[PDB]
Structures are given as C-alpha cells and as structure tokens.
Amino acid sequence: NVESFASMLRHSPLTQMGPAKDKLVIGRIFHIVENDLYIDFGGKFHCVCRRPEVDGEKYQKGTRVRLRLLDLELTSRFLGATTDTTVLEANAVLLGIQES
Amino acid sequence: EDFDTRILEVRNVFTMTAKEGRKKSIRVLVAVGNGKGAAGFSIGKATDRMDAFRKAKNRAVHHLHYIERYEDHTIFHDISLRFKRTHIKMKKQPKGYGLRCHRAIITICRLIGIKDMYAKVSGSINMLSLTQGLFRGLSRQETHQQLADKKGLHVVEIREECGPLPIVVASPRGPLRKDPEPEDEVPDVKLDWEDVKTAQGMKRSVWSNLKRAAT
Amino acid sequence: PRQRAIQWGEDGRPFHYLFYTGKQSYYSLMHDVYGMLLNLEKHQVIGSR
Amino acid sequence: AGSRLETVGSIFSRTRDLVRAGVLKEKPLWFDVYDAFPPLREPVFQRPRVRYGKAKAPIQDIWYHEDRIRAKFYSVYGSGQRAFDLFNPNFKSTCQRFVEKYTELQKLGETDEEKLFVETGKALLAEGVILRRVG
Amino acid sequence: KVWYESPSLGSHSTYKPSKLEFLMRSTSKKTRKEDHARLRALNG
Amino acid sequence: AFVIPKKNVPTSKR
Amino acid sequence: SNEDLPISMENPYKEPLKKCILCGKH
Amino acid sequence: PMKGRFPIRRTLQYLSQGNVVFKDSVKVMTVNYNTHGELGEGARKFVFFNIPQIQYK
Amino acid sequence: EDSTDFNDKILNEPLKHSDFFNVKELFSVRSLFDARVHLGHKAGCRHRFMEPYIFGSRLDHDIIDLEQTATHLQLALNFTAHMAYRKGIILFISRNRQFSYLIENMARDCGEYAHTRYFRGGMLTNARLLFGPTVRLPDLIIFLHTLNNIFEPHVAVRDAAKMNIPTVGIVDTNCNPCLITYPVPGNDDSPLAVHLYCRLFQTAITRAKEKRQQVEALYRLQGQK
Ligand code: FES
Numbered sequence: 001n002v003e004s005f006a007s008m009l010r011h012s013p014l015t016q017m018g019p020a021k022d023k024l025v026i027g028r029i030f031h032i033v034e035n036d037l038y039i040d041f042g043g044k045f046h047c048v049c050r051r052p053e054v055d056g057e058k059y060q061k062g063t064r065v066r067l068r069l070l071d072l073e074l075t076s077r078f079l080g081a082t083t084d085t086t087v088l089e090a091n092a093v094l095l096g097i098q099e100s
Numbered sequence: 101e102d103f104d105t106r107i108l109e110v111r112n113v114f115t116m117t118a119k120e121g122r123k124k125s126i127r128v129l130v131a132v133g134n135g136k137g138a139a140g141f142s143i144g145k146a147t148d149r150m151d152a153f154r155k156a157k158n159r160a161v162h163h164l165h166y167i168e169r170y171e172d173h174t175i176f177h178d179i180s181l182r183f184k185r186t187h188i189k190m191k192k193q194p195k196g197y198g199l200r201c202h203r204a205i206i207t208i209c210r211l212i213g214i215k216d217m218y219a220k221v222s223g224s225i226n227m228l229s230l231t232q233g234l235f236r237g238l239s240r241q242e243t244h245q246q247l248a249d250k251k252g253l254h255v256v257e258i259r260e261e262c263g264p265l266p267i268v269v270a271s272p273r274g275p276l277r278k279d280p281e282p283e284d285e286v287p288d289v290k291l292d293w294e295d296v297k298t299a300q301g302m303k304r305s306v307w308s309n310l311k312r313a314a315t
Numbered sequence: 316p317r318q319r320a321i322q323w324g325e326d327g328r329p330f331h332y333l334f335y336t337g338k339q340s341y342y343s344l345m346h347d348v349y350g351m352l353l354n355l356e357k358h359q360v361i362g363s364r
Numbered sequence: 365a366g367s368r369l370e371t372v373g374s375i376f377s378r379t380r381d382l383v384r385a386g387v388l389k390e391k392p393l394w395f396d397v398y399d400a401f402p403p404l405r406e407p408v409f410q411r412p413r414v415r416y417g418k419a420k421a422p423i424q425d426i427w428y429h430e431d432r433i434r435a436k437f438y439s440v441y442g443s444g445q446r447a448f449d450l451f452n453p454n455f456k457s458t459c460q461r462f463v464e465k466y467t468e469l470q471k472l473g474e475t476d477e478e479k480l481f482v483e484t485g486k487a488l489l490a491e492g493v494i495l496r497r498v499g
Numbered sequence: 500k501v502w503y504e505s506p507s508l509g510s511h512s513t514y515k516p517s518k519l520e521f522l523m524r525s526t527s528k529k530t531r532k533e534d535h536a537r538l539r540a541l542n543g
Numbered sequence: 544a545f546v547i548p549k550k551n552v553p554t555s556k557r
Numbered sequence: 558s559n560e561d562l563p564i565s566m567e568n569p570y571k572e573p574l575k576k577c578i579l580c581g582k583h
Numbered sequence: 584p585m586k587g588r589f590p591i592r593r594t595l596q597y598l599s600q601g602n603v604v605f606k607d608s609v610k611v612m613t614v615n616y617n618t619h620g621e622l623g624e625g626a627r628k629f630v631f632f633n634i635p636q637i638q639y640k
Numbered sequence: 641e642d643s644t645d646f647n648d649k650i651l652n653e654p655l656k657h658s659d660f661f662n663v664k665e666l667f668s669v670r671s672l673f674d675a676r677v678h679l680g681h682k683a684g685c686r687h688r689f690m691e692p693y694i695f696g697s698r699l700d701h702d703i704i705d706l707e708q709t710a711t712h713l714q715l716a717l718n719f720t721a722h723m724a725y726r727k728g729i730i731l732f733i734s735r736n737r738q739f740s741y742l743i744e745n746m747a748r749d750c751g752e753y754a755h756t757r758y759f760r761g762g763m764l765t766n767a768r769l770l771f772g773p774t775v776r777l778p779d780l781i782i783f784l785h786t787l788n789n790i791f792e793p794h795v796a797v798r799d800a801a802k803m804n805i806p807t808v809g810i811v812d813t814n815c816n817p818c819l820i821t822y823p824v825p826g827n828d829d830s831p832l833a834v835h836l837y838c839r840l841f842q843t844a845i846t847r848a849k850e851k852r853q854q855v856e857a858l859y860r861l862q863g864q865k
C-alpha cells in the first residue's frame with residue numbers, strides 16, 4: 001500500500017488550486033535586498049515584491065505575507081525564437097501580512 | 101609509435117590584411133592511423149608548412165575514430181553516403197581484391213587497416229569533404245553482431261567458394277526469435293544505376309578495370 | 316617567486332576544494348566574505364585605504 | 365591517445381573501442397562502474413529538431429473529474445477569501461471541501477448536476493462555511 | 500524574424516540598464532550589433 | 544616513421 | 558489500473574474568448 | 584539513384600525471374616483490375632510486379 | 641600475488657551488488673514530491689529530449705514523472721557512490737548563483753570539489769596548459785544545474801564528454817540531457833529541490849568514502865593474522 005506519484009499529484013494543494021491567476025496564497029519572505037522582498041509561496045519560483053510604504057519595517061526574513069497570484073512563471077515567446085524566454089520568477093501582488 | 105601519419109592536402113592560403121596586404125599561410129590536412137581500426141584526421145594551420153604538419157598530426161591523434169572491419173580486412177556492408185556535395189559509394193569486397201579507390205581513400209584505408217574495398221567518389225571532389233565524409237560513413241557501419249542483436253536472428257554467410265555450407269557469422273546474445281523474417285516478394289530498396297548498368301554489361305568505359313600497381 | 320607548491324599530492328587529488336576554478340585563493344576569499352554577510356543577517360576613511 | 369569526438373557515439377563506446385584497439389593502455393576509473401551499472405539511455409549526442417506539419421508533442425494535459433466541479437465553484441462563488449497555504453501538504457480549501465461534499469452526494473445516487481450543486485452549498489452553510497456568491 | 504535582424508544568441512539575457520552595471524563592465528567590451536537596439540528602443 | 548623539426552628545447556621553458 | 562491517473566478531457570478552467578463591444582449586435 | 588519506386592523491376596535480373604512461359608496456344612492476355620479496393624490488391628501487385636516478367640518471357 | 645586479491649576483494653566486490661551502498665534508503669517518491677522535484681518549467685520552455693521524462697502539463701506547467709526520477713536518481717546516486725568509493729575526483733558544477741554558496745559548502749564537507757564560478761575556456765580541454773602537465777582531471781562531474789545564465793548548456797557538459805568524463809546532472813524540462821551520462825529529471829530551481837539534491841549526493845559520497853575505509857581496514861587486519 002505504497003502511495004503512487006499519480007496519487008500525490010492529484011491530492012496536492014498546488015494541483016487542487018487550479019489556475020493561479022487571482023488566487024490568494026500565503027508566502028514567506030526568505031531573502032531581502034534593500035526594499036526587494038523575495039517571497040516563497042509553495043511554487044517552483046519565488047516572487048519579488050517591493051516593500052510596502054506602510055509598515056515597511058514589519059516585513060522581515062521569515063515574515064509570512066498574503067499574496068494575490070498572477071502567474072507561477074513569467075515566460076513569453078518573442079518573434080524569431082524557438083523556445084520561451086523565462087525570467088525564473090513568479091508574478092504576484094503583495095497585499096499585506098498574515099497574522100493570527 | 102604505433103601510429104602512422106599521412107598528408108592528404110597541403111594548400112597555400114592567402115589572407116588580405118589591413119596593413120600588410122596579401123599574407124601567405126599554410127593549411128594542411130593530415131590523417132593518422134595505427135592500421136588496426138583506430139584512425140583520425142585533423143587540419144593544421146601555420147605560417148610555416150612544418151608547423152602546420154606538427155599541429156595537424158598531433159591534434160589528429162586526439163580525435164581518433166574506431167572503424168569496424170569485417171575479418172580485419174574490409175567493411176561490413178556497402179556504404180553509400182553524401183557529405184555536402186561529395187558522394188562516396190563503397191563496396192564490401194573479398195580478400196585479394198585490393199584497394200580500388202580514390203588515392204586519398206587508399207591512403208586512409210591503409211591507416212585504418214582496410215585491405216579490400218571498392219569506392220567511387222562523385223560530385224564535388226573536395227579533399228576535406230571526402231575525408232570527413234569517408235570517416236562519417238565508416239564510423240556508422242553496422243556489424244554482423246549488431247545486426248543479430250537488433251533482429252534477434254542468426255546472421256548466416258553464404259560463400260560461393262564454400263558452396264551451400266551455411267556459415268553463421270553472428271548469433272544474438274539475447275533470446276532468438278521464432279518467427280521468420282517476413283519475405284517481401286520484392287524489396288523497395290533504391291538502386292544505383294551505375295551498379296545495375298555494370299551487372300547488365302551495358303557499362304562501357306575505357307578507364308574501368310584498368311591494370312594498375314598493387315595498392 | 317612564491318608559486319604555490321604542487322596543489323595536489325601523490326594521488327593527484329588537489330588539496331583545495333576550489334582547485335578547478337583556477338583561482339582557488341581568490342574564490343576561497345570571496346566564499347568566506349559572502350558567508351559572513353549571510354551570518355550577520357541571521358544575527359540581525361581618512362585614516363586608512 | 366584518445367578521442368574528443370563527443371558527437372560520435374558515447375564516452376563508453378569511444379572508450380571501449382580505443383581500449384580494444386590498444387590505443388588506451390589502461391581503462392579509466394569510471395569504465396568498470398559504467399559497465400556494471402549503466403544508465404537507462406546510452407549518452408549519445410543528438411541534435412534537437414523542430415516539429416513541422418502534423419507532428420505534435422506527446423505530452424498530455426493533466427485533468428481530473430473534480431476539475432469540472434472546481435471550474436464551476438470558482439465561477440459561482442469565486443476564490444475563497446481564505447488564503448491558500450501551499451506549504452501544508454494536507455491543506456484543504458473551501459473549493460476542496462466543496463468538492464468532497466459534492467463527491468459524497470453523487471455517491472448517494474444523485475445524478476443531476478444542477479441539483480447536486482445546489483444541495484452541496486446548503487450542506488456547507490449548515491456546517492458554518494461562508495459562501496458569498498460572486499454575482 | 501524580419502529583414503530587421505533578430506539573431507542574437509543571448510536573447511534570453513535579462514537586460515540590466517543601471518548606473519551600477521556600467522562600473523562593473525569589462526573596459527575592453529564594446530557595444531555589440533544588437534546592443535544599440537535596446538538603447539534606441541528604450542529611449543523611445 | 545620520419546623526422547620533423549621539434550617544437551622547442553625543454554630548457555626553453557618557464 | 559489506477560484511479561488517480563489523469564483523465565482525458567477538455568480544459569474545464571478555460572476562459573471564454575474575448576468579445577468586442579459590438580459582438581452579437583446588428 | 585534509379586528513378587521510381589521498386590527500381591528492381593527495371594533490371595534484367597528481375598525480368599528474367601519470371602517462371603510463366605505460355606504455351607504456343609496463348610495469343611492474347613487481357614488484365615482487368617481495379618485501382619482501389621482491398622479485394623483487388625493482388626491484381627494490382629500482379630500488374631505492378633509480374634506483368635513485366637510475363638511479357639519478358 | 642597480493643595485488644590481485646586486493647583488487648578482487650575491494651575494487652571488484654562492490655561491483656557485484658545491485659545497491660552496495662544502499663542509496664535507495666536515502667529518498668522516496670514522497671520525499672521527492674515534498675521537495676517539489678516534480679515541478680517543471682512552462683510548456684513553452686520544454687526541451688523535446690525531456691519529453692520522455694515528463695508526466696504531463698498541469699495548466700501549461702510541465703510535471704516531471706517522479707517514478708522515473710526515482711529510477712534515474714537511483715542510478716545516478718549509485719554511480720556517484722561507486723566513484724567516491726574508488727577515490728575518484730568528483731566535481732560539482734552549477735552557475736545558479738542562488739545556490740553557489742550552498743554547493744561550495746557541500747563539496748567542501750564531502751571532501752570533493754566545486755566549480756560554481758564563471759567557467760573559463762579550456763578548463764577541461766586545455767587543463768594541462770592551465771594547471772600543469774601532471775594535473776589530474778575529475779573522474780565524475782555532477783551538474784546541479786546544466787544550463788548557464790543565458791539558458792544555454794553549461795560548456796562543461798560538452799567538454800566533459802570531449803574528455804570522456806561521465807556526468808551526473810539534474811535536468812529540468814527546459815534542459816538537454818543527450819550528453820549527460822546519468823541524467824536525473826528534476827526541478828533545478830526550487831531551493832527545496834536543490835537542497836535535497838545536495839543532501840543526497842553529499843550523503844552518498846560520504847557513505848561510500850566511509851565504506852571504503854571499513855573494507856580496507858578489515859582487509860588489513862585479516863591479512864596480518
Ligand atoms: S468579437 Fe466582434 S463580432 Fe464577436
């Protein structure tokens with residue numbers, strides 16, 4: 001009775017989410033560069049969001065935040081290209097901080 | 101020490117330069133081989149011809165192909181290929197046939213260790229295309245053991261000098277198929293008009309089958 | 316000239332884990348400085364040239 | 365003496381052949397390991413080609429029966445104001461809770477789709493779930 | 500592509516037009532064929 | 544086998 | 558075989574195509 | 584290469600492999616065949632492959 | 641007289657066992673799934689030679705079949721352990737700067753080598769000039785990322801094949817695995833995936849080196865008496 005990969009994939013939260021556009025997810029700040037927040041939200045790629053003007057000091061490494069997802073991976077195919085150009089990051093809008 | 105080096109082409113290349121006008125350099129093509137299947141070729145470029153020789157021959161020994169030989173004297177099957185605009189058609193031959201091939205192919209065949217082969221070069225006769233075209237075709241030849249393994253059947257050689265005796269040359273290492281190979285009444289293989297015109301006695305050439313020195 | 320002694324032993328194994336960069340001393344220094352910048356985050360002129 | 369023709373065969377085939385020809389006096393340290401435990405595919409250079417005409421990749425889109433329920437739920441009720449927590453491997457969203465109830469009621473013999481969808485919302489409201497219709 | 504050439508190999512490179520990059524650049528380096536294009540189009 | 548001019552003298556090295 | 562394997566069907570999350578302001582009007 | 588599919592048919596060796604040598608009585612042989620249809624496939628291959636051998640002999 | 645017994649009891653004995661180092665106990669399809677190894681790039685970035693190893697596309701995002709990853713990872717870890725057991729030089733290569741520091745530490749800790757920096761022309765194909773005529777090259781090169789920073793194959797993939805060095809490589813869905821000796825289809829971007837790979841190779845290498853010492857020591861004690 002060993003779980004198969006097909007079973008893990010069916011019942012994974014990322015599979016159950018469906019399309020990522022306009023989906024609220026909880027992210028975690030893992031790296032900070034000046035006012036650029038690098039946030040992991042459970043996907044393949046992190047998103048980069050600028051520090052909000054209000055309560056900017058509350059956003060620190062480890063701070064859990066609320067995001068509105070737009071794309072899991074920003075990619076586009078440009079004229080005369082055989083493959084897609086990827087910037088290796090997700091697109092999301094930082095809404096605020098998650099609190100209990 | 102086991103490798104011999106042969107020159108295939110020595111060219112004088114002339115480069116127009118911004119300040120020094122026409123300058124003269126040397127491009128050399130050389131082939132190396134040990135006579136036991138290991139052979140290669142390399143281009144050399146230097147101002148002095150002797151330097152171009154040293155560069156090519158030393159580089160060629162690091163780009164060695166291994167060439168499979170049937171009974172260590174000929175190729176495993178007829179090879180017909182085109183490299184760019186140079187066509188090479190090679191025929192497997194029995195012992196004693198010798199090397200009846202373009203002189204450059206003769207030189208390379210002695211380095212590889214092929215003793216009996218017929219070859220015809222058509223189209224562009226470009227030494228570089230011929231050299232790398234020849235090595236490409238000789239390195240992609242399927243041996244009898246590979247044929248037996250691919251089809252899981254015996255490879256049986258019939259020689260007219262040995263009559264009807266079946267000579268198994270290769271047997272599959274894996275299981276042996278039980279279903280005979282389908283017998284297509286007529287094969288859809290493409291033929292060379294030169295080969296057919298010769299077999300029908302319609303090929304007339306004063307230059308074919310001429311007496312030549314042992315090669 | 317203090318060219319470093321052979322950078323490998325008799326078995327041929329290089330001593331430094333960054334040997335194959337060709338700049339092991341420079342990249343070993345960059346690695347040590349980059350590591351210090353990381354640890355600070357986890358924790359958190361005229362006189363000389 | 366060796367071969368740098370990386371596009372001719374594989375490192376194994378090129379190494380095996382030069383050892384037979386006597387060009388390599390010793391086998392490399394990795395050869396015996398490769399022979400004992402070879403890869404699934406022999407590493408031979410290949411040139412990736414572009415597809416033309418009626419040639420299409422065999423990759424198939426991954427879909428599930430419950431995806432139909434999820435598409436309708438998102439259309440009717442939108443994404444839940446509750447936020448997905450993709451770090452918890454057992455996270456259940458309002459949509460997944462809806463899908464599980466929808467699956468239970470279907471197994472009880474109900475077969476209509478429009479009726480099986482309205483009864484599911486009522487059950488969750490009874491359990492205290494917030495379902496604000498988008499329109 | 501069009502008669503306007505778009506063959507550049509590093510087409511996936513992320514363009515970084517910042518004041519800091521200019522200082523961290525090989526002095527030997529000269530503007531490539533399609534390097535001016537991004538400047539002509541970014542200025543627009 | 545044949546003779547070609549040698550590349551250099553080993554004393555002529557760093 | 559296995560119940561959790563993907564099944565073939567058409568995209569259920571596909572959005573409708575865009576329409577101009579005058580689509581469907583004389 | 585030799586033009587057409589199955590260029591072997593245009594060789595003297597192939598044409599001499601016919602085993603049908605008609606008796607002196609045979610003066611005319613008409614072949615009625617259909618270009619399409621699974622049940623007329625052998626007749627098409629007979630026209631394609633063997634009529635040349637029959638005529639040669 | 642005594643050398644043949646050495647090579648037979650120490651060098652040839654591990655090659656008679658299917659998993660001599662028990663590298664299958666190091667990972668599972670579940671452990672790989674939790675590290676997000678199955679997450680690939682978007683379908684538009686797919687390489688056609690990676691199609692065999694792809695389970696499917698989930699809303700235009702390719703999913704890597706972890707059943708194959710587990711089989712490929714088993715072979716790659718097994719080969720790596722045997723090469724570490726034989727005291728081969730293992731070189732880790734990656735140009736992804738998010739993980740340069742992590743990879744350099746993993747190499748130092750396992751007693752191997754890392755090259756995460758700009759790869760200069762000819763490090764492998766012109767090594768004798770760059771390092772010296774007696775320089776020993778790596779016996780195994782492990783790519784944790786097979787692509788450079790302009791999304792082309794790392795030059796060392798081609799140059800390792802030219803120098804007949806076997807390569808282990810994590811190959812994402814936009815990568816080309818043709819010339820990688822032991823490819824492992826897996827996510828090369830997510831920190832959880834990369835951290836997992838570094839733990840597995842580090843452990844496989846460290847175990848094989850300790851196993852080599854155990855066998856040698858036993859073979860000597862028994863030899864005297
Ligand atoms: S979108 Fe214009 S008529 Fe439909």
Ligand SMILES: [Mg+2]
Binds near residue numbers: 681813827828
């Ligand atoms: Mg990737």
